[PDB]
Amino acid sequence: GVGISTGTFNNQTEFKFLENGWVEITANSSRLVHLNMPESENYRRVVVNNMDKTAVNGNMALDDIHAQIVTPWSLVDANAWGVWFNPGDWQLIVNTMSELHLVSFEQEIFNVVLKTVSESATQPPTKVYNNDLTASLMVALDSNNTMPFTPAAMRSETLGFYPWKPTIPTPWRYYFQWDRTLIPSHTGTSGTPTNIYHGTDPDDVQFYTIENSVPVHLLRTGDEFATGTFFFDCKPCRLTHTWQTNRALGLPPFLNSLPQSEGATNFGDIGVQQDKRRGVTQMGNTNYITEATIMRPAEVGYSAPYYSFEASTQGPFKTPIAAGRGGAQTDENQAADGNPRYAFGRQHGQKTTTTGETPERFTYIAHQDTGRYPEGDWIQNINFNLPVTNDNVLLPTDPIGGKTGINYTNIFNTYGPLTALNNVPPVYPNGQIWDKEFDTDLKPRLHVNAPFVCQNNCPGQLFVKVAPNLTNEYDPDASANMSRIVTYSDFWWKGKLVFKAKLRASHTWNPIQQMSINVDNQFNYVPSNIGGMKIVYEKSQLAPRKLY
Amino acid sequence: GVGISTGTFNNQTEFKFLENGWVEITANSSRLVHLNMPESENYRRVVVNNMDKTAVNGNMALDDIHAQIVTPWSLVDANAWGVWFNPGDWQLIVNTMSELHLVSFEQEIFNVVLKTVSESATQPPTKVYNNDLTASLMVALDSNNTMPFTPAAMRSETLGFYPWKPTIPTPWRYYFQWDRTLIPSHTGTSGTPTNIYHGTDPDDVQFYTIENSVPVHLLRTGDEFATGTFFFDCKPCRLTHTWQTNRALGLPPFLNSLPQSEGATNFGDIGVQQDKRRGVTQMGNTNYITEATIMRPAEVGYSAPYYSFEASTQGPFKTPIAAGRGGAQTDENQAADGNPRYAFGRQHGQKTTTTGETPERFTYIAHQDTGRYPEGDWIQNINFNLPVTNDNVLLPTDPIGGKTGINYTNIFNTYGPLTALNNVPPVYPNGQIWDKEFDTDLKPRLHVNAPFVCQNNCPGQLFVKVAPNLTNEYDPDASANMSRIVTYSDFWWKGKLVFKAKLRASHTWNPIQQMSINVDNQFNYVPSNIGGMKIVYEKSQLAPRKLY
Amino acid sequence: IGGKTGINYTNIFNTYGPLTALNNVPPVYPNGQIWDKEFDTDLKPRLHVNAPFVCQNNCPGQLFVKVAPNLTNEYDPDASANMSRIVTYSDFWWKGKLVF
Amino acid sequence: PAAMRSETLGFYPWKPTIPTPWRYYFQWDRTLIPSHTGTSGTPTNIYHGTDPDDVQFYTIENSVPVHLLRTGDEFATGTFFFDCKPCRLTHTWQTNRALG
Amino acid sequence: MDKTAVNGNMALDDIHAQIVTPWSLVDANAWGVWFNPGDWQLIVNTMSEL
Amino acid sequence: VGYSAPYYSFEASTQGPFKTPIAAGRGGAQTDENQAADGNPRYAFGRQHG
Amino acid sequence: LPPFLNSLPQSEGATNFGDIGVQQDKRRGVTQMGNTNYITEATIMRPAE
């Protein structure tokens, strides 16, 4: 009814321990969503063109030319870790569990309130907000996944992370087809390369509308819309990292001489010469069996061509890399490729009382040792004389193509049938939870943006829009814009995400690295005297696991 | 039989998760115990007298005069935390659980081996060790608790903490009655005070023997002795600490002025004068309602007379204190009373390859804020004029009895019917697990040495002794010592301690302090290149809990 | 005591013992508290000095109330300023029932 | 408990009342050395800060289910049942000088 | 701290830290909420335990 | 019956000084409003509460 | 548990005493003095009073 509520606020996460060390995690989340009427009631087709920026030779990485369809609908997106967990629940899950399953997902909309602004133009020009009890909110649930899938976590435009703060939805848009061609150059190149935007191929035109595809529900004040329960079928995401490289697989060599005194410089020693040892190598012309030459079962990780831009029908793009380097060799100073860098605003983890429009940034360096250190690689000739000569090695200090800043590791690629690698780790709080698999014949082995991939079907997207509120003067045969009453809405969203985890067990004599609070990160978890909150990122794969 | 084994080595700890968030922890432990034949086969009554040490005036804290009965039996004692858990299992229990129950306890002895040394006196004088298949080992289990209860963890004489290292049992002894009287003095006292050892009261003489009290089992090589399962009935031991003092109980005052800018120096302010506020105090002649004067429901902790030696029938002793101070005010520099100090050797956590006979020491500072800071206490007159006068306060800088190093906090005592306090926390690895309740009419509310107190009955003590191996020449009517064959033994001990714990839950937005490994304590959990191991102490009450 | 003429030994005296008998606190009309919560500690106090009844295992839960946010048309969560709301208040009726 | 700050509901049934703005204590560390009037120098009057081992930040939203009430709505707590010792309405007069 | 900076006034300490929440509390834990002086006179004069 | 407590005794701890609570104070023929005592509570309140 | 005696008497008499063969600052056990290495019979921790 008019003065009857249709739902209940709930933002609790529960832990229900089953038998055999399985625990059912059910995270609830509720928000207050503020929605304005759209700027235009029509679908647009806008072409973005920053050709003045890439007209300077060398700046071809800054390309932004694309085409998109601007729709009057808005999207409610809750596909991020920080929507469902606070740092206490995340510390509990990360420290106590070993693997994670994704079970189900629901959402609903209740307690709709529509108000109209009537700006009484005084000399202090005021505005009185009145309830419009007969206005409607239009809600479309794309359960068959007919619309193009747009995850909002990649643009940092999901729901907010604080339960006591009102949030906004994202204006929806999708990509339209275009053709462009950009020839690269460098600073000090004679002439201008081709920088051409061709247009649209008629064989690839797809124009989607919400009205022709999805049934749209009209919600007044006493109405309530509830999505049913979707059920996932996914692979488990493991909360442990591996440390073993190719240099630490299998049986170590037997030491015939052990140290007799304590110290960091009392080393052990194999008492056999390198040309008198036993074991298997893969060098048919070499009697040396060392730690770098001994045969391993497979290879962990691979080398990829890093900072490689590939061009296609719609312009250049960067090549994605599955796992980057990180650990004792690389810091914030030592720049690497493969580690993602997140940017976000005050709604998603930045300090709420900060000044300026510069976002907050961090680079996520994972714990799994599956990367490569490109400054220590080399090729050598198959003759394999051990004091190697100048013209028999390919070093990373040798120029490729005459360019002194390019070596062979920039174009190297060692992916093969012996390559083993790991899935991507979850990133709290800004990371995505699930993702959709590509509708192609040969599917990729992993995604670099989400730990779960719903294979057959994913949860349908939820669209929302304020219904048009017309005035007395309205002529559809006139070419001008539709004149509407200034209306906005407030509704309550409530979701429920259910997981399933397994409690970890101790295997070693020594303790394990855990997530804790100390004197350094103390004031990152409490509000300030004004109420400024923030959410700093936390690691997810803390405990180690033996690979082999 | 002779060539048949009678048991299985087991040193695994299991975690069996039940329903409703309860987990059954079952710790197994196994050792190899090395036992020699006793020095004498008789019971002795030895009186220890260090009267030359306390003959100097002022050293009366160094009293060691007592009397004891030296028995030829040895004790197998496994009442310590480090016998049952490694640091990985302790990290799991401390980080994941909230309370701890003690359920049952078993032990057994198997695979007995008795050998005789026959020293063939050559010029390199050798010794050949021969199996004596008909020798016996005597095992007595005092299941009715007839012998006096002696816990070996208070003298650091339990079993070892490493499963791959052979251990020894403790030679048993108990206290005999004596009477002594020592009058204290100081350096520069005219004359000598009374330093007299009187003797034994005949009303209090108790001489216990193992043979007249306990049935003794004789074990040959094919024999095996197994204690049954004892079942505890105890209160649960909680793995969370409290932080709330008397200054943080109840509703805070309402602030009429909040800060407008961020900073450590933008304070809030109650906008009411101290003589115009509302609330309840306990001062009938004072209109001031401040944070120190406002009525609280009860009192947390108490003041005790610290470093107070009390004298009785058998000499002076220190007064035990339940909870000492510790935290932001006290460090290793700022000495305190109430916090225990442990000393131990290479078998119990010291570095195994260290040099010297100086033991390893640490002071255990707990996390629970239930102590007192004696430098900030004061008494004042009941007239309560607020700028207080010199002769109306009792300060800790005022001398008591004319002594400049003694103030009133050394003789103060504020235990009352309003005092609330907490049980003692477990100390890993050197701390005791269970303790026996006193057989008196009015029992103490807690013990300062063990978190569990078995009230009605405790597990019985296990005594062990090599049976006498006589030679051909033996005359009992001759006053000389019995001549025996030099014999020793090796047997395997195996115990099983079962607990019950409850998994913790998250309640706050912020994370909780956990136990972790880092770059500082990294090499405390791995062996060295010689095999030197150590066990450093770990805290047990890490998470906080609201008191009120 | 200690050379101070305004302090005697009764200010530092304490004669609580195992022979001490004493009474519970009396109710104070009208300003006094009715019930109180027991401390969640291992060794609990024998009485409280502020309420005659102490609910030992559990006490009645507290009741919190708040007016829901009433936003205007201009609202930007990415702006560091304060949320602008419509000035709202409430009136409700409370009704309790205590049985002795 | 709000009775210790004199901030409960009103005592007259025919008079409108207000509720109390909620707040709780956060952890801090401070140290104050006492003195008297006419003491040479200044004692230590230091506010240290917060211990990270004792930080507890509670919110209503993450802990309690919150009901939304419009005009036609009504919220009713169930019946809680106490288990307490009886409070006696008689006093004792006998000292140690009047026993036996 | 300006109040307790004068020597001798250390009973007037008010330094603490608190969390200020936007919620309000309905508290009816007092004797005067439930009884008028007539009912209190009846209970006090006629009864012995409660 | 009853006990003696250290009266107007301020104890200090981690978070500052506080007064020691006393269970029962004196009162009767010897003590009046003039004769100040310790243990008896003192209430302050406003127009809403009496 | 009493302390272990490393030297027992060899003759009978009221003045043939035993002796702990460890110095007072070299013994093991639990005390309640955080600033003292001496473990004597008056300093050693007892369960209650």
PDB file of N, CA, C and O in Angstrom, chain B residues 168-197:
ATOM      1  N   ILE B 168      64.181 -37.568  29.060  1.00  0.00           N
ATOM      2  CA  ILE B 168      64.452 -38.241  30.327  1.00  0.00           C
ATOM      3  C   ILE B 168      63.304 -37.954  31.287  1.00  0.00           C
ATOM      4  O   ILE B 168      62.620 -36.932  31.135  1.00  0.00           O
ATOM      5  N   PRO B 169      63.038 -38.812  32.267  1.00  0.00           N
ATOM      6  CA  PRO B 169      62.055 -38.474  33.297  1.00  0.00           C
ATOM      7  C   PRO B 169      62.723 -37.793  34.484  1.00  0.00           C
ATOM      8  O   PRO B 169      63.945 -37.704  34.584  1.00  0.00           O
ATOM      9  N   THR B 170      61.886 -37.310  35.391  1.00  0.00           N
ATOM     10  CA  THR B 170      62.324 -36.524  36.531  1.00  0.00           C
ATOM     11  C   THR B 170      62.399 -37.386  37.785  1.00  0.00           C
ATOM     12  O   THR B 170      61.463 -38.134  38.075  1.00  0.00           O
ATOM     13  N   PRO B 171      63.495 -37.315  38.539  1.00  0.00           N
ATOM     14  CA  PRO B 171      63.565 -38.041  39.815  1.00  0.00           C
ATOM     15  C   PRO B 171      62.586 -37.464  40.825  1.00  0.00           C
ATOM     16  O   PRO B 171      62.574 -36.262  41.085  1.00  0.00           O
ATOM     17  N   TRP B 172      61.764 -38.335  41.396  1.00  0.00           N
ATOM     18  CA  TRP B 172      60.647 -37.880  42.207  1.00  0.00           C
ATOM     19  C   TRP B 172      61.092 -37.577  43.628  1.00  0.00           C
ATOM     20  O   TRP B 172      62.003 -38.219  44.157  1.00  0.00           O
ATOM     21  N   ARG B 173      60.440 -36.591  44.238  1.00  0.00           N
ATOM     22  CA  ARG B 173      60.670 -36.186  45.612  1.00  0.00           C
ATOM     23  C   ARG B 173      59.478 -35.360  46.060  1.00  0.00           C
ATOM     24  O   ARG B 173      58.772 -34.778  45.236  1.00  0.00           O
ATOM     25  N   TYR B 174      59.238 -35.326  47.367  1.00  0.00           N
ATOM     26  CA  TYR B 174      58.157 -34.518  47.908  1.00  0.00           C
ATOM     27  C   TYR B 174      58.625 -33.830  49.179  1.00  0.00           C
ATOM     28  O   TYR B 174      59.712 -34.105  49.684  1.00  0.00           O
ATOM     29  N   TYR B 175      57.794 -32.925  49.684  1.00  0.00           N
ATOM     30  CA  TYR B 175      58.168 -32.121  50.837  1.00  0.00           C
ATOM     31  C   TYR B 175      57.870 -32.849  52.140  1.00  0.00           C
ATOM     32  O   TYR B 175      56.841 -33.513  52.282  1.00  0.00           O
ATOM     33  N   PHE B 176      58.774 -32.707  53.101  1.00  0.00           N
ATOM     34  CA  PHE B 176      58.595 -33.219  54.450  1.00  0.00           C
ATOM     35  C   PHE B 176      58.399 -32.025  55.371  1.00  0.00           C
ATOM     36  O   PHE B 176      58.762 -30.906  55.010  1.00  0.00           O
ATOM     37  N   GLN B 177      57.820 -32.250  56.546  1.00  0.00           N
ATOM     38  CA  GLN B 177      57.491 -31.133  57.420  1.00  0.00           C
ATOM     39  C   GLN B 177      58.726 -30.632  58.156  1.00  0.00           C
ATOM     40  O   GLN B 177      59.571 -31.415  58.593  1.00  0.00           O
ATOM     41  N   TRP B 178      58.824 -29.312  58.291  1.00  0.00           N
ATOM     42  CA  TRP B 178      59.875 -28.698  59.085  1.00  0.00           C
ATOM     43  C   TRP B 178      59.341 -27.400  59.667  1.00  0.00           C
ATOM     44  O   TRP B 178      58.281 -26.917  59.273  1.00  0.00           O
ATOM     45  N   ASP B 179      60.084 -26.843  60.620  1.00  0.00           N
ATOM     46  CA  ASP B 179      59.754 -25.570  61.248  1.00  0.00           C
ATOM     47  C   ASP B 179      60.992 -24.689  61.220  1.00  0.00           C
ATOM     48  O   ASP B 179      62.072 -25.127  61.624  1.00  0.00           O
ATOM     49  N   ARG B 180      60.838 -23.454  60.753  1.00  0.00           N
ATOM     50  CA  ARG B 180      61.947 -22.514  60.756  1.00  0.00           C
ATOM     51  C   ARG B 180      61.421 -21.108  61.006  1.00  0.00           C
ATOM     52  O   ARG B 180      60.236 -20.828  60.814  1.00  0.00           O
ATOM     53  N   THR B 181      62.315 -20.231  61.453  1.00  0.00           N
ATOM     54  CA  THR B 181      61.966 -18.875  61.857  1.00  0.00           C
ATOM     55  C   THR B 181      63.084 -17.922  61.465  1.00  0.00           C
ATOM     56  O   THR B 181      64.231 -18.099  61.889  1.00  0.00           O
ATOM     57  N   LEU B 182      62.749 -16.907  60.671  1.00  0.00           N
ATOM     58  CA  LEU B 182      63.732 -15.958  60.155  1.00  0.00           C
ATOM     59  C   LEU B 182      63.212 -14.543  60.370  1.00  0.00           C
ATOM     60  O   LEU B 182      62.160 -14.181  59.837  1.00  0.00           O
ATOM     61  N   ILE B 183      63.949 -13.747  61.136  1.00  0.00           N
ATOM     62  CA  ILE B 183      63.589 -12.355  61.392  1.00  0.00           C
ATOM     63  C   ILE B 183      64.320 -11.468  60.390  1.00  0.00           C
ATOM     64  O   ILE B 183      65.553 -11.540  60.288  1.00  0.00           O
ATOM     65  N   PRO B 184      63.615 -10.626  59.635  1.00  0.00           N
ATOM     66  CA  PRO B 184      64.277  -9.842  58.588  1.00  0.00           C
ATOM     67  C   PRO B 184      65.049  -8.661  59.154  1.00  0.00           C
ATOM     68  O   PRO B 184      64.845  -8.231  60.291  1.00  0.00           O
ATOM     69  N   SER B 185      65.945  -8.131  58.331  1.00  0.00           N
ATOM     70  CA  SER B 185      66.791  -7.005  58.705  1.00  0.00           C
ATOM     71  C   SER B 185      67.219  -6.286  57.431  1.00  0.00           C
ATOM     72  O   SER B 185      66.701  -6.554  56.343  1.00  0.00           O
ATOM     73  N   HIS B 186      68.173  -5.370  57.564  1.00  0.00           N
ATOM     74  CA  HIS B 186      68.720  -4.653  56.424  1.00  0.00           C
ATOM     75  C   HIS B 186      70.217  -4.480  56.626  1.00  0.00           C
ATOM     76  O   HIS B 186      70.757  -4.767  57.696  1.00  0.00           O
ATOM     77  N   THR B 187      70.889  -4.007  55.580  1.00  0.00           N
ATOM     78  CA  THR B 187      72.326  -3.784  55.631  1.00  0.00           C
ATOM     79  C   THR B 187      72.659  -2.623  56.555  1.00  0.00           C
ATOM     80  O   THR B 187      72.185  -1.502  56.357  1.00  0.00           O
ATOM     81  N   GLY B 188      73.476  -2.895  57.566  1.00  0.00           N
ATOM     82  CA  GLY B 188      73.762  -1.904  58.581  1.00  0.00           C
ATOM     83  C   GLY B 188      72.809  -2.004  59.752  1.00  0.00           C
ATOM     84  O   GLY B 188      72.274  -0.996  60.222  1.00  0.00           O
ATOM     85  N   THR B 189      72.587  -3.228  60.225  1.00  0.00           N
ATOM     86  CA  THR B 189      71.744  -3.500  61.384  1.00  0.00           C
ATOM     87  C   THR B 189      72.643  -4.041  62.487  1.00  0.00           C
ATOM     88  O   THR B 189      73.434  -4.961  62.251  1.00  0.00           O
ATOM     89  N   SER B 190      72.531  -3.466  63.681  1.00  0.00           N
ATOM     90  CA  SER B 190      73.373  -3.884  64.792  1.00  0.00           C
ATOM     91  C   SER B 190      72.906  -5.229  65.334  1.00  0.00           C
ATOM     92  O   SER B 190      71.736  -5.396  65.689  1.00  0.00           O
ATOM     93  N   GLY B 191      73.823  -6.185  65.392  1.00  0.00           N
ATOM     94  CA  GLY B 191      73.514  -7.511  65.884  1.00  0.00           C
ATOM     95  C   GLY B 191      73.024  -8.432  64.788  1.00  0.00           C
ATOM     96  O   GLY B 191      72.964  -8.086  63.605  1.00  0.00           O
ATOM     97  N   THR B 192      72.660  -9.642  65.209  1.00  0.00           N
ATOM     98  CA  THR B 192      72.192 -10.686  64.300  1.00  0.00           C
ATOM     99  C   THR B 192      70.774 -11.082  64.687  1.00  0.00           C
ATOM    100  O   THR B 192      70.510 -11.377  65.867  1.00  0.00           O
ATOM    101  N   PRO B 193      69.840 -11.093  63.739  1.00  0.00           N
ATOM    102  CA  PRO B 193      68.484 -11.560  64.047  1.00  0.00           C
ATOM    103  C   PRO B 193      68.447 -13.073  64.196  1.00  0.00           C
ATOM    104  O   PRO B 193      69.422 -13.771  63.906  1.00  0.00           O
ATOM    105  N   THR B 194      67.304 -13.580  64.647  1.00  0.00           N
ATOM    106  CA  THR B 194      67.162 -15.013  64.861  1.00  0.00           C
ATOM    107  C   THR B 194      67.032 -15.735  63.528  1.00  0.00           C
ATOM    108  O   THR B 194      66.123 -15.456  62.743  1.00  0.00           O
ATOM    109  N   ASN B 195      67.952 -16.670  63.278  1.00  0.00           N
ATOM    110  CA  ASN B 195      67.978 -17.473  62.056  1.00  0.00           C
ATOM    111  C   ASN B 195      68.072 -18.927  62.519  1.00  0.00           C
ATOM    112  O   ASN B 195      69.154 -19.508  62.601  1.00  0.00           O
ATOM    113  N   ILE B 196      66.920 -19.517  62.831  1.00  0.00           N
ATOM    114  CA  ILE B 196      66.847 -20.774  63.567  1.00  0.00           C
ATOM    115  C   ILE B 196      66.037 -21.785  62.769  1.00  0.00           C
ATOM    116  O   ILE B 196      64.940 -21.479  62.293  1.00  0.00           O
ATOM    117  N   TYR B 197      66.582 -22.990  62.628  1.00  0.00           N
ATOM    118  CA  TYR B 197      65.856 -24.142  62.099  1.00  0.00           C
ATOM    119  C   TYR B 197      65.484 -25.020  63.288  1.00  0.00           C
ATOM    120  O   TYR B 197      66.353 -25.597  63.944  1.00  0.00           O
TER     121      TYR B 197
END
